[PDB]
Design a protein around this ligand. Structure first.
Ligand SMILES: NC(=O)C1=CN([C@@H]2O[C@H](COP(=O)(O)OP(=O)(O)OC[C@H]3O[C@@H](n4cnc5c(N)ncnc54)[C@H](OP(=O)(O)O)[C@@H]3O)[C@@H](O)[C@H]2O)C=CC1
Ligand SMILES: NC(=O)C1=CN([C@@H]2O[C@H](COP(=O)(O)OP(=O)(O)OC[C@H]3O[C@@H](n4cnc5c(N)ncnc54)[C@H](OP(=O)(O)O)[C@@H]3O)[C@@H](O)[C@H]2O)C=CC1
Ligand SMILES: [Ca+2]
Lengths: 323, 323
């Protein structure tokens, strides 16, 4: 019931222009509608690829919805001037007059949030975007922002994009309550923990095999290792894999599939409120594999219990949902 | 360095009028200053006892600072009218014209927070209290409240009273950052987890011994059991007890003492910001025992590591700091 959005992060990085176009064709041919990219993804090659797929983005004669973000990393801030530069560039790349969703990618702890939101309003007034979004803000920062917008009559954020998966559930305690209260819908990223929950890695690979992927041989490799590559995580994947063979046997699904099905059927996400899962992939064979799992049904209760047991294993060493 | 406040919950319940007066005398004779009670504590007998100790409370010729609260349980709400009835009664009981701190005991999910705060302001304008407080609100509810007060020119809350102890640290992740941002000081309750961290119980008592205390034979017995009486908690106390004997030997302190010393020396509480620990007791022998531990010095690092290891044991099954 929960929506599916296309994660365009690896477009320009692991997937070339052709592979990315193929993936977008596949995604849309399953009736899905929305795509997530960002100013910063693959040095801007992501937004430029999508902008050149002739999707007439931002138009009225247009079925596809597009999402982008502005960050306060590198030279950039979320101060008014930088904020504009980043969006205006995203637009020129995407070859469109406006985006459907515009996120603040992360908190800019050096810029008062008031200044940023006023600037967001002024940009909304100019029709550069439809909906405002937040990502990686703490629950309480969201509460502040929404209250400031109500009282200053600025556009309220209506979508939160956050780190959520079967073995990473910090968002549940405070963020979700908060989001439901202020009426934001939640879009999940890292739904496979970068691929860790596909079960294709073993802990001992950090010392030896080091397979070129999300966790090895790129700029952000180490960050992702500090996030998800813990011993207790690999215990938890094993625990689920054993529970899968036990309850399903020979007919057992891949735990790529199991992990995605957890998000769609057994998480706190709710189709009713417009929540979505942002799917990640580095290849077409992976997307087809994942889109299938999206449509698959719910899991036996004994497996959902095992996921829960695995989460309890790692909860103490869980990464923060906020920067 | 962190302050000490007297928990007056058991006054009228486990401690009679005489025992409570004795405890207040002892507490003040160590140079401490502030006392925490509530409208609801022991059906009002707490506030009435304190009011009859001739402390000339709320007066100018008065060394002691007094704290009370209004709840939205039972008939009561935090709507303006109820709010007044509760405070006005607290005053008549305490025999004083104003309280030094006035908490909203818990969130009233059936009353818009705006209505409540306006009423709090109007009551502050009338000089019924000095400082406004919150308790058991989610970090993000606090952020909302403070922002509404700034923008509506109402009194801001300046003290948060929250559930905090060596084996219960959920407040650390989001609440504390938030509190430091809005300038609230934190007062810890449940510092001994209701007495569980005194190490006087063993898990197997629920089935047999059931010793009349915080955890047995009262209205709230079962709530406290659902909060702290878990198997993994008792593991953790054992882990600390072994670490104490290991690093200190024969000269090892009681882990009533160790637990309190953790709050005062090794927690996130900071004397600098005016943070405090609210001490609980059901007898005078307990208070003298605890007040001693308050003044004791810091702990060996190997023991602080053991507390940390114990917290990691129970973090997944940790009670929420918010209602
Ligand atoms: N702003 C934010 O806070 C964030 C937003 N996002 C957005 O959300 C999306 C989701 O995040 P992401 O980390 O991609 O989510 P995932 O947890 O699903 O990670 C996707 C990764 O998992 C692996 N994978 C994908 N498909 C398969 C498969 N079929 N079988 C085995 N492994 C597979 C791939 O890793 P590998 O290359 O190792 O094979 C792929 O790169 C991103 O695309 C991006 O648009 C992402 C990160 C941050
Ligand atoms: N803001 C809020 O929502 C809350 C506020 N409060 C406040 O917090 C204060 C402190 O909380 P409280 O839970 O009472 O504090 P603790 O967590 O320290 O628990 C106190 C209880 O533990 C036991 N105990 C005390 N001293 C000893 C000792 N020396 N050796 C062994 N056991 C001991 C006693 O329980 P027993 O005799 O029954 O075994 C005592 O009644 C309260 O008094 C109250 O003012 C309390 C709850 C909620
Ligand atoms: Ca282990």
């Amino acid at each position: 019931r929960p929506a599916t959005v296309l994660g365009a992060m690896e477009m320009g990085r692991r997937m070339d222009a052709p592979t990315s176009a193929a993936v977008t064709r596949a995604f849309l041919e399953r009736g899905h509608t929305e795509i997530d990219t960002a100013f910063v993804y693959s040095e801007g090659q992501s937004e430029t690829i999508l902008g050149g797929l002739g999707l007439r983005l931002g138009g009225s004669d247009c079925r596809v919805k597009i999402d982008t973000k502005a960050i306060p990393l590198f030279g950039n801030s979320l101060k008014p001037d930088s904020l504009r530069f980043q969006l205006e560039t995203s637009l020129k790349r995407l070859q469109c007059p406006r985006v459907d969703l515009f996120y603040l990618h992360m908190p800019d702890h050096s810029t008062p949030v008031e200044e940023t939101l006023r600037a967001c309003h002024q940009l909304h007034q100019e029709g550069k975007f439809v909906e405002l979004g937040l990502s990686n803000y703490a629950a309480w920062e969201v509460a502040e922002i929404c209250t400031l917008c109500k009282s200053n009559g600025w556009i309220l954020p209506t979508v939160y994009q956050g780190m959520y998966n079967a073995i990473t559930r910090q968002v549940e305690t405070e963020l979700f309550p908060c989001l439901r209260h202020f009426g934001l819908r939640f879009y999940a990223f890292n739904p496979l923990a970068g691929g860790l929950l596909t079960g294709k890695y073993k802990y001992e690979d950090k010392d030896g095999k080091q397979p070129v992927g999300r966790f090895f041989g790129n700029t952000w490799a180490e960050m992702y290792r500090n996030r998800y590559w813990k011993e207790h995580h690999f215990e938890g994947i094993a625990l689920v894999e054993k529970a899968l063979q036990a309850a399903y046997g020979a007919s057992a699904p891949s735990m790529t599939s199991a992990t995605l099905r957890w998000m769609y059927h057994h998480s706190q996400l709710q189709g009713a409120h417009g929540d979505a899962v942002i799917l990640g992939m580095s290849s077409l064979e992976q997307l087809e594999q994942n889109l299938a799992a999206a449509e698959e049904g719910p899991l036996e209760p004994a497996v959902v219990d095992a996921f829960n047991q695995a989460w309890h294993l790692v909860a103490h060493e869980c990464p923060n949902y906020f920067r």
